[PDB]
Amino acid sequence: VEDEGLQPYQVRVICRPKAETYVRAHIVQRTSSNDITLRGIRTGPAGDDNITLTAHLLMVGHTPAKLERLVAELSLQPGVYAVHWYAGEHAQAE
Question: Which domain of life is it from (predicted)?
């Protein structure tokens, strides 16, 4: 089965590694309750005291207000430097 009914969105949040721990858990619990399916989360150190969690998600339907709320919550975690979501798992800037 192909997924062209679940739009790939990548949510990249740059936060402290100490935050990454609860942020990554927060991502998986939010997505599973928000009708968002996960592809995987690419977590990598990208700076000095920061790690960028790039969560590749597929959202069924896509309700922007939900995704935005989750992104705001991810940013709401104490330790986030920045967060941004982009459409396309592979960052498809077409």
Answer: Bacteria
